[PDB]
Amino acid sequence: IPPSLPQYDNLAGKLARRAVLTSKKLVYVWTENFANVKGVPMARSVPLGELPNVDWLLKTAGVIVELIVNFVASLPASAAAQFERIAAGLSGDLEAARQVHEALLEEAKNDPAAAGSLLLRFTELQTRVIALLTRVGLLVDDILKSADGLNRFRAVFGTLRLPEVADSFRDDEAFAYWRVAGPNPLLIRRVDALPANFPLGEEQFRRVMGADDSLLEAAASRRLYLLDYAELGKLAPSGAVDKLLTGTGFAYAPIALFALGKDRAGLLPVAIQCGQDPATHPMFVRPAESESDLYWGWQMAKTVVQVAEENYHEMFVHLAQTHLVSEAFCLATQRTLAPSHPLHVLLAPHFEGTLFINEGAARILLPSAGFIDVMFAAPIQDTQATAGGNRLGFDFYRGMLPESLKARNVDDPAALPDYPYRDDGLLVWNAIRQWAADYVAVYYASDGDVTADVELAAWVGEVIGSGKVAGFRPITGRSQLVEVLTMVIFTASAQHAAVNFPQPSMMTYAPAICAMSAAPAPDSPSGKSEADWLKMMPPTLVALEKVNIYHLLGSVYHGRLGDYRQTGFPYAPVFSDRRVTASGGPLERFQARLKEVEATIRTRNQARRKPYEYLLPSRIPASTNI
Numbered sequence: 001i002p003p004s005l006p007q008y009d010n011l012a013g014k015l016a017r018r019a020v021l022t023s024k025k026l027v028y029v030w031t032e033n034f035a036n037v038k039g040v041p042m043a044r045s046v047p048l049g050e051l052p053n054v055d056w057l058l059k060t061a062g063v064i065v066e067l068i069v070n071f072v073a074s075l076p077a078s079a080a081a082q083f084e085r086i087a088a089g090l091s092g093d094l095e096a097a098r099q100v101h102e103a104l105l106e107e108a109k110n111d112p113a114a115a116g117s118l119l120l121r122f123t124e125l126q127t128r129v130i131a132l133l134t135r136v137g138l139l140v141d142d143i144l145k146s147a148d149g150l151n152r153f154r155a156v157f158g159t160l161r162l163p164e165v166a167d168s169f170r171d172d173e174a175f176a177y178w179r180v181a182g183p184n185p186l187l188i189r190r191v192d193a194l195p196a197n198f199p200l201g202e203e204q205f206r207r208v209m210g211a212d213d214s215l216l217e218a219a220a221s222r223r224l225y226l227l228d229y230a231e232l233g234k235l236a237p238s239g240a241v242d243k244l245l246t247g248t249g250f251a252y253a254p255i256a257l258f259a260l261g262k263d264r265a266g267l268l269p270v271a272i273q274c275g276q277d278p279a280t281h282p283m284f285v286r287p288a289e290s291e292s293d294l295y296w297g298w299q300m301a302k303t304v305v306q307v308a309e310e311n312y313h314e315m316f317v318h319l320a321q322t323h324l325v326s327e328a329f330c331l332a333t334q335r336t337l338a339p340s341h342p343l344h345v346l347l348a349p350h351f352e353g354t355l356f357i358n359e360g361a362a363r364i365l366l367p368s369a370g371f372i373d374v375m376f377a378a379p380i381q382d383t384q385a386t387a388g389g390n391r392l393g394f395d396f397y398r399g400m401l402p403e404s405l406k407a408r409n410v411d412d413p414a415a416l417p418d419y420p421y422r423d424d425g426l427l428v429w430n431a432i433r434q435w436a437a438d439y440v441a442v443y444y445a446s447d448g449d450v451t452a453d454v455e456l457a458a459w460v461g462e463v464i465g466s467g468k469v470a471g472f473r474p475i476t477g478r479s480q481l482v483e484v485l486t487m488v489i490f491t492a493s494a495q496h497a498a499v500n501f502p503q504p505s506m507m508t509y510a511p512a513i514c515a516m517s518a519a520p521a522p523d524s525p526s527g528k529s530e531a532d533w534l535k536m537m538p539p540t541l542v543a544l545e546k547v548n549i550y551h552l553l554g555s556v557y558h559g560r561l562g563d564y565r566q567t568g569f570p571y572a573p574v575f576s577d578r579r580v581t582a583s584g585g586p587l588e589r590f591q592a593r594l595k596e597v598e599a600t601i602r603t604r605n606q607a608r609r610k611p612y613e614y615l616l617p618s619r620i621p622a623s624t625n626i
């Protein structure tokens with residue numbers, strides 16, 4: 001039976017669907033008092049049907065067990081004894097659980113008619129792998145209870161290969177390239193006049209870029225780009241923050257200027273101010289290779305920027321603006337769009353695992369003494385409130401990719417050619433938009449169908465009200481609905497992938513990036529030494545948690561954008577409506593467009609300085625689930 005808008009449903013349908021929604025509202029419940037994320041709309045609890053499926057669980061547990069094995073194997077024999085039996089047990093039990101799944105799948109194939117009798121056993125296996133994860137939790141607690149000068153930062157990897165950044169992190173061009181191809185491609189903006197509190201002069205600029213260049217000429221020819229971390233607020237504490245587990249830590253809200261050469265061959269760092277106030281933060285100017293008395297001050301200044309970057313990327317770009325936005329849309333959808341509504345059918349796959357993983361963020365990562373309290377310099381209460389505040393301030397329309405690019409004046413490939421996130425992101429954004437347009441056109445023939453849809457009206461009301469999604473507004477027509485759906489889907493799939501999956505290759509090595517420093521910002525551009533820079537490096541506990549959590553979060557690829565097939569047993573099609581699924585129809589056209597996009601990105605990557613692969617559709621999950 002094809003999905004329908006409520007106004008066109010037969011009365012049998014209208015009462016069935018309305019009672020189903022009444023039932024949903026008792027199961028999916030809003031709260032703004034969820035532990036460790038106060039003020040952010042969350043599910044009060046994760047319903048049984050929102051627990052992760054066995055496929056996700058086996059994949060996630062597999063990575064976690066690899067990490068445990070790797071950690072135990074890195075220890076000396078005396079220390080390993082405490083954990084070897086427990087690790088061998090988890091490993092063996094995971095393998096047994098894989099075999100139960102494989103036997104169940106073979107059993108279902110041998111008699112599909114009788115496959116309905118297996119559902120309690122599939123849920124039993126779900127319960128079992130979750131219980132295995134609870135045992136991991138206890139083991140992690142025990143490990144933490146027993147917790148060139150950079151050897152310790154290689155040691156925490158065990159036998160995992162160090163990422164490429166471990167070799168290249170001191171390079172100026174690599175540092176600049178993070179701004180357009182790194183985990184946070186959203187902050188960089190064109191600058192036309194410098195902020196008043198960033199007093200970089202013409203002479204300093206020419207010192208770096210040459211006597212025949214100038215600030216005026218660079219600005220006017222669209223060659224100046226600024227990173228300004230002012231929005232970090234309390235994520236950049238005033239001074240020292242002392243904590244039990246990690247001792248004394250610092251973080252920062254710096255300002256950095258980047259410039260293209262006249263040939264636009266690549267972005268270069270020009271100057272860094274390590275805080276917002278120039279009276280207390282001197283200007284650091286990119287040194288020449290011969291200026292050994294400026295070298296270490298500059299390394300320290302870049303490290304200040306990278307400290308700011310992990311804070312901004314992880315709390316705002318990753319947690320606040322993907323995970324915590326998709327939380328609200330998941331809830332609104334389940335509470336207000338009936339399962340027989342075509343938009344429920346379309347959107348539900350894009351929220352698979354979202355409630356579960358976000359509850360995990362709040363319960364595991366955000367409490368006092370948890371991962372974020374260790375890895376991020378600010379007091380945990382400030383981290384929670386600042387990340388929460390960023391989620392509440394995030395404007396849904398202004399946050400749309402095209403709008404973001406235009407507002408930052410980075411949307412013109414002629415002015416800023418090497419910006420992989422922009423170029424690949426637009427291909428994916430536009431493919432999703434055409435899909436949303438085709439799908440909306442099946443079910444909505446007029447703007448009247450949009451405004452007379454009482455469920456959609458209620459959905460918008462919940463997104464604005466209980467969901468606290470800033471910038472969201474009444475939906476009065478088909479074009480607008482298409483833009484909204486494009487943003488919801490892109491946010492859940494591609495945006496998350498772009499900022500989540502760089503974690504293993506770019507964020508696992510603490511000297512290249514860390515959300516806390518063990519020393520204040522460099523007090524002077526000149527006279528610094530390697531020892532002064534090493535003092536910024538965090539304690540080893542920070543590095544240990546970092547390598548493991550960031551490897552995990554970027555190693556689970558579950559589901560795929562455009563596949564629209566269940567990701568757990570029985571793996572059935574998401575759509576039944578032949579108007580959607582027909583040969584050459586909307587879904588097939590979307591799937592085909594995604595393959596063209598993939599081919600285009602692969603061609604672009606042959607010509608790029610380094611491949612950018614995070615927005616390859618084959619590497620984009622449909623939902624935010626890790």
Ligand SMILES: CCCCCC/C=C\CCCCCCCCCC(=O)OC[C@H](COP(=O)(O)OCCN)OC(=O)CCC/C=C/CCCCCCCC
Nearest residue numbers: 064067068071133134136137314319357360361364548626
């Ligand atoms: C950090 C910034 C991220 C921001 C974005 C957050 C977005 C959402 C991501 C949320 C992710 C939530 C955390 C992952 C969720 C994994 C799926 C899951 O739900 O797992 C549940 C288990 C058990 O939970 P429970 O409450 O019983 O006990 C926790 C400890 N008190 O949690 C873990 O395995 C610990 C994982 C920590 C990582 C261990 C890595 C291997 C360690 C082995 C080597 C030991 C080294 C210490």
Ligand SMILES: [Fe+2]
Nearest residue numbers: 496500553626
């Ligand atoms: Fe994530």
Ligand code: NA
Nearest residue numbers: 573574575581
């Ligand atoms: Na299909």
